Every structure is written in structure tokens, then in C-alpha cells.
Amino acid sequence: TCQPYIMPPLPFTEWLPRKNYTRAYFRPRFVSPRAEFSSLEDINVPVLPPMTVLERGMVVSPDNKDPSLPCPPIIDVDVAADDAVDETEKLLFGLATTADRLDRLLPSLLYSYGNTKAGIIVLVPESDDDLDKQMTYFRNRGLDLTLIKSPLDFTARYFGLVQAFAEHIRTKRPQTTWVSFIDDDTFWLSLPTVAEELKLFDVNKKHYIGALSEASWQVDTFGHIAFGGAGVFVSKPLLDVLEQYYDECQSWGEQPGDQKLGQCIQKYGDTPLTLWPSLYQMDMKGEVDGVYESGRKIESLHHWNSWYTKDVVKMTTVAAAAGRKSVLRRWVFDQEEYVNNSTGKSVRTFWVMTNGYSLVKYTYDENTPDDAINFDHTEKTWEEDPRGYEGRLGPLRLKDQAGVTKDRWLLREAYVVGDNVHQWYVREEDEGHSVIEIVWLGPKGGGGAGVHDYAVRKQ
Amino acid sequence: TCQPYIMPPLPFTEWLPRKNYTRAYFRPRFVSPRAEFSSLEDINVPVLPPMTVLERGMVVSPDNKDPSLPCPPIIDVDVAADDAVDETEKLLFGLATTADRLDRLLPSLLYSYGNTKAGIIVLVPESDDDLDKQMTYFRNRGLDLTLIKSPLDFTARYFGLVQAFAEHIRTKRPQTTWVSFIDDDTFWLSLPTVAEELKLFDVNKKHYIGALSEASWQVDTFGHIAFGGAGVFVSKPLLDVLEQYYDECQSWGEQPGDQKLGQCIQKYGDTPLTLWPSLYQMDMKGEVDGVYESGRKIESLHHWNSWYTKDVVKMTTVAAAAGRKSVLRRWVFDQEEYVNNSTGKSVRTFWVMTNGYSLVKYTYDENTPDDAINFDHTEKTWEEDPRGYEGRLGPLRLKDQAGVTKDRWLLREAYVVGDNVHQWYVREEDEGHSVIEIVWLGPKGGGGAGVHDYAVRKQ
Numbered sequence: 001t002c003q004p005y006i007m008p009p010l011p012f013t014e015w016l017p018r019k020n021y022t023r024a025y026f027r028p029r030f031v032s033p034r035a036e037f038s039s040l041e042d043i044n045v046p047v048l049p050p051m052t053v054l055e056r057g058m059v060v061s062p063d064n065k066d067p068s069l070p071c072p073p074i075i076d077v078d079v080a081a082d083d084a085v086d087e088t089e090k091l092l093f094g095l096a097t098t099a100d101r102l103d104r105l106l107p108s109l110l111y112s113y114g115n116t117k118a119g120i121i122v123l124v125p126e127s128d129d130d131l132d133k134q135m136t137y138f139r140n141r142g143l144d145l146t147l148i149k150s151p152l153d154f155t156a157r158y159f160g161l162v163q164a165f166a167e168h169i170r171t172k173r174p175q176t177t178w179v180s181f182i183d184d185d186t187f188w189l190s191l192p193t194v195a196e197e198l199k200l201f202d203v204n205k206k207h208y209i210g211a212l213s214e215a216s217w218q219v220d221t222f223g224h225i226a227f228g229g230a231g232v233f234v235s236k237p238l239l240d241v242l243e244q245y246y247d248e249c250q251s252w253g254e255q256p257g258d259q260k261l262g263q264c265i266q267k268y269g270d271t272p273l274t275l276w277p278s279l280y281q282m283d284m285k286g287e288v289d290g291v292y293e294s295g296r297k298i299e300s301l302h303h304w305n306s307w308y309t310k311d312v313v314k315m316t317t318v319a320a321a322a323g324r325k326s327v328l329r330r331w332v333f334d335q336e337e338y339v340n341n342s343t344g345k346s347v348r349t350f351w352v353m354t355n356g357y358s359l360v361k362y363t364y365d366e367n368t369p370d371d372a373i374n375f376d377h378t379e380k381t382w383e384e385d386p387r388g389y390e391g392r393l394g395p396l397r398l399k400d401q402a403g404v405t406k407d408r409w410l411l412r413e414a415y416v417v418g419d420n421v422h423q424w425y426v427r428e429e430d431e432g433h434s435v436i437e438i439v440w441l442g443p444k445g446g447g448g449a450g451v452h453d454y455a456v457r458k459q
Numbered sequence: 460t461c462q463p464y465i466m467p468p469l470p471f472t473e474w475l476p477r478k479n480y481t482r483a484y485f486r487p488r489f490v491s492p493r494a495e496f497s498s499l500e501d502i503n504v505p506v507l508p509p510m511t512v513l514e515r516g517m518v519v520s521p522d523n524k525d526p527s528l529p530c531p532p533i534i535d536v537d538v539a540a541d542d543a544v545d546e547t548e549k550l551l552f553g554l555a556t557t558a559d560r561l562d563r564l565l566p567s568l569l570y571s572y573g574n575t576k577a578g579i580i581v582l583v584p585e586s587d588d589d590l591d592k593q594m595t596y597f598r599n600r601g602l603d604l605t606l607i608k609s610p611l612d613f614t615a616r617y618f619g620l621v622q623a624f625a626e627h628i629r630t631k632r633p634q635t636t637w638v639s640f641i642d643d644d645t646f647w648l649s650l651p652t653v654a655e656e657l658k659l660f661d662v663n664k665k666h667y668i669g670a671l672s673e674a675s676w677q678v679d680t681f682g683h684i685a686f687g688g689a690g691v692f693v694s695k696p697l698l699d700v701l702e703q704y705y706d707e708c709q710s711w712g713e714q715p716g717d718q719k720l721g722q723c724i725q726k727y728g729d730t731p732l733t734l735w736p737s738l739y740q741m742d743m744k745g746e747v748d749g750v751y752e753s754g755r756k757i758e759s760l761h762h763w764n765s766w767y768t769k770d771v772v773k774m775t776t777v778a779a780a781a782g783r784k785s786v787l788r789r790w791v792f793d794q795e796e797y798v799n800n801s802t803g804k805s806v807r808t809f810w811v812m813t814n815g816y817s818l819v820k821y822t823y824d825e826n827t828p829d830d831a832i833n834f835d836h837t838e839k840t841w842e843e844d845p846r847g848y849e850g851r852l853g854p855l856r857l858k859d860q861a862g863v864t865k866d867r868w869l870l871r872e873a874y875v876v877g878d879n880v881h882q883w884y885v886r887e888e889d890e891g892h893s894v895i896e897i898v899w900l901g902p903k904g905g906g907g908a909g910v911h912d913y914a915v916r917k918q
């Protein structure tokens with residue numbers, strides 16, 4: 001009749017209230033890591049069963065006609081397998097932060113760099129802290145990094161990584177070929193994929209890879225630099241030049257280190273900036289739904305714990321079942337039409353799932369055509385003026401478009417239970433607590449997210 | 460072959476890092492609701508297996524003696540059944556707060572009052588808000604209340620509940636015979652049990668039931684009143700007297716409403732204050748482990764979202780499987796002894812589980828006796844001066860007692876998966892992330908927490 005019943009994990013914040021609930025099963029099928037999909041893949045089979053009024057727990061309310069939950073279908077989708085972490089060994093990341101900030105952002109740092117072969121050195125302020133004890137605290141939890149005390153300030157310690165990079169490579173990590181400046185809130189959706197894409201650049205030539213800010217006035221203010229929030233990559237030959245002229249470039253005031261880095265490369269590096277539009281600085285505040293639901297290639301995120309608030313750790317939970325590259329992938333399904341037999345015009349309805357972010361139900365009215373939304377255009381949902389984001393984020397759609405209704409279910413909870421990942425999307429409607437659960441039926445032993453790469457730093 | 464393996468629900472904050480892990484099973488056998496238990500019930504069989512080093516996810520690390528997780532036993536523990544919610548109908552609770560604060564505290568309010576027969580009226584500030592919409596917003600989620608607009612200020616709205624109570628009882632709730640003043644952070648561990656205990660009072664006589672602050676200086680400052688945060692109970696005959704002298708008592712400044720209520724009863728009520736020590740105002744800051752792990756009869760809690768921080772919603776999650784009365788119940792187990800065959804002295808260890816709060820491993824040194832801790836004496840763990848709390852909280856013990864080591868695993872996560880509740884206790888040790896999981900195997904259909912009282916407010 002049905003298709004073992006998996007019980008949803010429910011915190012009391014979700015178990016206690018009454019809720020309108022529906023669930024769908026998605027079965028990830030892993031293909032090549034180099035496989036490519038559409039920005040919005042279609043599912044031509046019914047997906048979301050009708051909602052069921054539930055009471056405390058999962059008890060079916062007596063308001064429902066059917067006394068039971070609907071039988072949800074299993075939707076097979078193709079996902080690109082995770083890339084190998086072998087190419088990550090050539091990377092050495094550098095941070096200017098504190099051990100307290102590393103501990104607060106530990107889960108996000110574990111997803112980005114944990115269970116990879118990349119090295120991390122951190123310039124921390126001067127203190128009485130036991131660096132060996134703090135280093136063991138993070139390494140035993142899965143984050144192998146090197147803590148180095150520095151007398152410089154945070155702004156100077158950022159550029160001070162140039163000297164820290166060179167000495168660490170010369171003395172401890174000679175196999176390093178790529179060096180990377182990062183913020184502690186620079187979140188990599190798939191670091192091994194980035195390491196694989198760095199192979200296209202000659203390792204023996206100088207290279208300066210980064211991204212511009214999405215806000216045009218930030219580029220006007222600070223110049224065409226690699227904004228440090230999105231991540232910066234500097235090849236070893238360019239680092240050798242930066243070390244040669246470190247004393248001539250390093251100021252000791254409050255100039256942003258990423259701007260100082262770009263100006264030093266512009267002056268003595270003879271290396272142009274290589275632009276990676278997949279790295280996102282996120283120089284924007286408010287609702288970031290448009291960028292996350294854009295279907296664009298997103299390899300790094302930023303500002304998610306300051307300028308705006310977004311649990312990127314909760315968002316990447318699905319990677320344990322469907323791989324890293326499945327995060328923020330878009331599927332469209334459940335297209336329904338409600339025609340008026342007198343006028344012939346119809347109100348159309350369809351769903352778009354941004355994996356790990358949102359479930360959006362779109363309603364086109366009688367006067368709204370089918371192509372009213374180009375989902376390859378980025379919806380402008382943030383606060384700043386949209387004119388400064390047209391150049392970087394392409395042609396922007398309006399947040400409030402006439403004739404279009406956008407009901408959004410934001411991801412509230414996510415849990416890994418065995419081989420499955422339970423996604424708990426929630427919309428707080430006036431008529432109740434609306435819940436949409438997506439259970440990803442991942443393969444045995446895990447679908448990725450570094451679950452098999454625990455001994456990859458050994459020996 | 461272990462004694463159907465239940466996979467633990469893991470958020471990415473717990474799935475990503477490496478961790479030292481252990482789990483024990485607890486099967487609550489439900490007995491009579493009036494059954495009493497010791498403040499520290501013994502478990503005489505081994506409970507906690509040896510710790511297993513786990514990598515990312517639940518992968519058994521090669522840094523382990525055995526390649527598999529141990530088979531943990533199932534501990535049978537007697538728990539008292541939840542009381543009936545019939546006696547809650549006589550209660551009418553009054554709040555002086557806003558719809559925004561009700562929304563932020565909705566889960567805790569749902570556990571306290573949801574799925575009971577008690578009424579709730581709230582005096583909210585004047586605004587253009589659609590009161591009927593907000594009422595439907597909370598009622599559809601499980602919290603039925605009446606929102607009344609009031610021009611009075613906050614302190615006046617609290618005592619203004621005297622008029623709001625009398626009018627609501629006379630016109631909408633005539634069956635109300637107990638009226639209760641509460642804060643929005645007044646948390647009830649078992650409201651039906653409190654409603655049952657209120658039957659011990661003659662319902663036709665004036666009654667003023669409350670609790671004094673634990674800090675003696677707060678009583679010296681504001682008097683021997685029923686402190687509002689712990690919850691105040693006023694019988695209907697006393698409310699009639701309070702309404703007769705409302706104008707003579709109600710001021711218009713910033714006098715605390717609970718002190719104003721007590722002073723009005725003192726001047727016109729002719730009713731002494733009946734002290735309930737089980738209601739705790741929680742007039743303390745810092746680590747509140749001593750009160751929560753005291754084994755004392757705790758029926759109301761307060762200040763858990765302001766003066767101190769404690770997710771009382773996560774704490775009561777186990778009540779879905781072991782009943783409301785199991786929360787904060789204590790069990791001691793795993794008494795181990797490590798003697799020295801030369802001197803004969805021994806180092807002894809044992810565990811004390813405060814259900815839903817903490818797992819503490821005590822270590823007594825060679826010169827510490829077995830009676831070194833009276834677990835009926837409240838450990839002084841909060842910030843303020845201990846002398847001000849000796850009267851209310853009995854003889855206190857020191858947080859740092861010589862020869863006694865206290866390693867505490869605090870409750871980090873809690874989930875209800877079908878008939879089971881998973882408790883995720885966490886201690887952040889210098890050598891790694893330490894996790895002890897307790898899986899409560901509740902009975903079929905849920906162990907309580909109002910899972911069967913969903914249709915109890917029907918007409």
C-alpha cells in the first residue's frame with residue numbers, strides 16, 4: 001500500500017504546537033562529480049501530498065477527513081557526487097581572528113575545512129593563552145589548524161599572513177602551492193570542488209583569484225580588488241613576490257587588509273585579478289532569499305552571521321545524504337491549473353524547492369503569464385538599492401511582482417538520522433503552524449559531506 | 460546482536476565534529492500518579508558503557524579498541540503517570556504582556572498551559588492590532604487565550620488583572636474559582652498536578668497562595684509577598700474583595716504589581732499568605748545547576764530567559780516519554796571504586812543524572828568520605844552571596860568542595876522520535892567533544908506531556 005515508516009525527529013518547539021504538516025521523500029542518486037544540472041530541474045510527477053492537520057506530536061487532528069497521514073511518494077533525483085579531497089592538500093588557508101571566534105564558528109569551519117587535506121594557520125592576538133592546548137582542543141574536534149600569536153592589529157594581521165604564509169610553507173608545509181586569505185565566516189559549500197577547479201591555472205605562474213563585491217559602490221569605494229569575505233586565492237609564485245615587498249606594502253593603520261593585498265599585487269605583483277563570480281562577498285543586508293534561491297553557482301558565502309542571519313550549517317545538512325553540490329539546488333514540481341470554465345483564464349500554481357533553504361509556492365493569477373518569472377534572474381529581496389547590484393547579480397526581478405503570490409517555507413530544522421536527512425521547512429501562517437518536511441533517503445554509509453574522509457590527514 | 464537499533468537524530472552541529480560518545484537506554488514503567496520516589500533513586504546495574512571515539516557522523520574511529528559501538532543496557536525506572544487535566548478548568552491565568560512576547564515564548568507557554576482546561580486572559584497595550592487575528596494565531600497553534608487591550612502601563616496592567624479577572628469570570632468564565640497571576644516566563648512543570656493540589660483548600664474561603672524569593676534581601680526589600688514570577692494563586696472569594704477595593708489599591712506609578720497585590724490583600728483581604736516552597740521565583744544569576752539538580756519538588760520555574768539562561772523547553776522534552784513528573788528527577792548509578800592495594804585507600808566515582816538537565820560524574824579522592832555530599836542539600840552554584848539563600852534553599856553545599864571533582868554534561872539537544880525521546884548531553888572537554896546520549900523508550904502512544912489532551916477544550 002505505502003512505499004518502513006521513518007519517524008520525524010521533533011524538538012519540543014515543534015512537537016508541542018499544533019501544525020499543518022506534509023512530507024515528501026527524495027532519493028538522491030549519485031552521478032559523476034563533473035555532472036551538470038539545470039538551474040531549476042523539473043519533476044513531472046506529484047511530490048507534495050495534501051496537508052494534514054496535526055495536534056501535539058504527530059497525532060492526526062480530528063479536523064482531517066482521512067484519519068491517517070497520506071502516503072508520500074519517493075522522488076528520484078540525480079546529484080553530483082562529492083569531489084575527492086586529494087587536491088585540497090595544495091591549499092593553505094590563513095586567518096586573522098581569535099580562538100574564541102573559532103570556537104563560536106566551529107561547526108561552519110568544520111564543514112568548510114574539516115576532513116580535508118588543507119592547512120590552516122591563524123594569526124591570533126598576543127595573550128597568555130596556551131596555543132598548544134587550544135590547538136589540541138580544535139584538532140580533537142576535527143579542525144586541524146596552527147595558532148600563531150601576533151603583535152599586529154586585526155587589520156595588519158590580515159596582511160601579516162603574507163609573512164606567516166611564507167615562513168609556514170618554507171618550514172612546515174613545502175607542498176603548499178596555493179595560499180588563501182579568508183574570513184572566519186567565509187563558508188565553502190564544496191571546498192574539494194574549488195581545489196579541483198584551481199588545477200586549470202598554471203601552478204608555476206602568479207595568480208590572484210577572487211570576487212568583487214555585489215554592491216557597485218563598494219567596488220567604487222575600495223577598487224577592483226578581491227574582497228576578502230568571498231575568499232582570495234594567491235598562487236605560491238605570487239606569494240613569493242608579496243613577501244619580497246612585504247615591508248613596502250604593510251601599513252600599520254586601519255586600511256582593510258584585502259584592499260591592501262590587492263593594491264600590493266597591483267603595484268609589485270604584475271598579476272591581474274582573476275574574477276570568480278561563484279565566490280560571494282554578500283555585501284547586502286536584510287532578506288538574502290534572492291541570492292540563495294537564485295540557482296547560480298555558489299561556492300563561497302559570507303556575512304551570514306553579521307550583516308544578515310542565516311544558518312548555513314543547518315542549510316548544508318542535506319549534504320550528508322545528497323552530497324555537497326546538492327545544497328541550494330532548485331527543483332520545480334507540482335504544477336497545477338485552476339481554469340474558469342466561463343472566461344477560460346486560469347490561476348496557475350507551482351512549487352520551487354531551494355534545497356536546504358526554502359520551499360516557495362508560486363501563484364500566478366488570471367492576468368499573469370507562465371513566463372512572468374525568469375528564474376535565472378536574481379530576485380531582489382535585500383534592503384539596499386537594487387541599482388548597485390545590477391552589474392554583479394545580473395538582471396534583477398522584483399520582490400513584489402504584480403499578479404504573483406510567493407508563499408515561502410523557510411528551513412527551520414535539519415537532522416541526520418542514519419542515512420537519511422530530515423529537512424523541516426516552516427511557514428508561520430495566520431491560520432496555523434505550516435510545516436513541510438523533506439526526508440532525503442541517502443545511501444548506506446552516508447552520501448558525502450566528508451563522512452568517509454576522516455583518516456585523510458593521517459600519516 | 461544488541462539488546463532494532465535506533466539511530467540518533469544529529470543536527471550538523473553534532474554530526475560534523477569528532478566526539479567521544481556513549482549511550483544508555485531508559486525504559487520508564489508508568490505507575491500511579493500519586494506514587495512518590497526518593498530524591499536520588501539508585502540504579503544498581505551498570506548503566507553507561509565505555510566511551511567510544513567517534514569521527515564525523517556516527518563512524519566508529521580507528522582510534523578505538525573495538526570497531527563497533529557497545530550494546531548498552533535498558534534501565535527500567537518507575538515514573539508516575541501524568542495527572543488528569545480536569546481540575547485545571549477551575550483556573551484562570553492572567554498575563555500583562557504583549558503579543559510579541561507571547562509569540563517568542565510560545566513553546567514554553569504551550570507546555571505549561573496548552574492542552575489543559577485552564578483559561579488565559581492577557582492585558583496588552585493599546586494599539587491598532589487585530590485582536591481576533593492574534594487570538595486565532597495562538598489558538599490554532601494550541602494556546603487558547605483572550606487578548607484584552609488596556610491603557611494602563613505594565614505595572615498597572617498586572618494589578619489591573621483584578622478588574623479583568625472579575626469581568627471575565629462574570630461574563631465568560633463563571634466556573635472559574637481559582638485566579639492566578641503569572642509572568643510570561645512563569646514555567647509550570649506539571650500544571651495538572653498543581654490543579655489537583657489546589658483541591659486541598661476550601662474553595663469557598665479566601666486564599667492567597669504564593670512563594671517568597673530565594674534571596675532573603677529581596678524579601679527584606681519588598682516584604683513577605685507572593686513573588687509574581689513564581690506564580691500566584693488567589694481564590695475567588697479573595698478576588699471579590701480585591702475588586703471591592705481595586706480603586707483604593709490600584710496606584711498609577713511603577714510599584715511592582717505583585718507587591719501591590721500582596722499589600723492590597725494585607726490591607727483589605729484579611730487573608731494570610733500561604734507559602735508554597737515548590738514555586739521558585741529564581742531570584743539568582745549565573746549557573747543555576749544547584750537548584751535544578753537539587754531533587755527538590757519543583758513545580759514552577761522563572762527567570763530562565765532573562766536573569767539566567769536555561770532552555771526549559773528542551774529540559775521538559777523527556778516528559779513526552781517518561782511523564783511530566785520525570786523532569787528533574789535524579790538517579791544515581793555506576794558506583795565505581797579504584798583502590799590502592801598498598802595503602803588500602805580508594806578513589807570512588809559515581810554518576811548523578813538530573814533528568815533533562817545534566818549528567819554529573821563525581822570523583823571522591825582518597826581522603827574524601829562517601830558522605831561528603833548530602834544530595835538533599837542544595838549546591839550553591841549561582842553568583843550572589845550564599846548567606847542570602849540559606850533560609851529558603853536550606854543548608855547549602857559549596858560548588859568547589861575539596862577532594863570532590865564534578866564533571867558536568869549539560870543537556871544540549873533533545874528530540875522526540877515516535878515513542879522515544881533522545882537526550883543529547885554534552886561536556887566540552889579539553890581532549891574533545893564529550894557526548895552522553897540517553898534514549899527514553901516511552902510507551903506506545905506517548906508517555907504524556909499532553910499528547911492525549913488535544914480534544915480537552917472541545918465544546
Ligand SMILES: O=c1ccn([C@@H]2O[C@H](COP(=O)(O)OP(=O)(O)O)[C@@H](O)[C@H]2O)c(=O)[nH]1
Pocket residue numbers: 095096097098101154182183184185229303305306307
Ligand atoms: O576572520 C575574521 C573576520 C572578522 N573578524 C572581526 O569581526 C569583525 C566583523 O567582521 P565580519 O566578517 O562580520 O564583517 P566584515 O568585516 O567581513 O564585513 C571585523 O571587523 C573583525 O574585528 C575577525 O577577527 N576575523
Ligand SMILES: O=c1ccn([C@@H]2O[C@H](COP(=O)(O)OP(=O)(O)O)[C@@H](O)[C@H]2O)c(=O)[nH]1
Pocket residue numbers: 554555556557560613641642643644688762764765766
Ligand atoms: O509577564 C511579563 C513579564 C515580564 N515582562 C517584561 O519583562 C520585564 C522583566 O522581564 P522578566 O519578567 O524576565 O524579569 P522580572 O520582572 O520577572 O524580574 C518587565 O519589566 C516587562 O517589561 C512583560 O512584559 N510581561
Ligand SMILES: OC[C@@H](O)[C@@H]1O[C@@H](O)[C@H](O)[C@H]1O
Pocket residue numbers: 213218222227228229256257258259283
Ligand atoms: O576592502 C574592504 C572590504 O572588505 C569592505 O569593507 C567593508 O566595507 C566590508 O567588509 C567590505 O565590503
Ligand SMILES: OC[C@@H](O)[C@@H]1O[C@@H](O)[C@H](O)[C@H]1O
Pocket residue numbers: 672677681686687688715716717718742
Ligand atoms: O515585587 C517585586 C518583585 O517582583 C522583585 O522585583 C524585582 O526585583 C524582581 O522581579 C523581583 O525580585
Ligand SMILES: [Mn+2]
Pocket residue numbers: 183184185186229302303
Ligand atoms: Mn567576514
Ligand SMILES: [Mn+2]
Pocket residue numbers: 642643644645688761762
Ligand atoms: Mn518574569
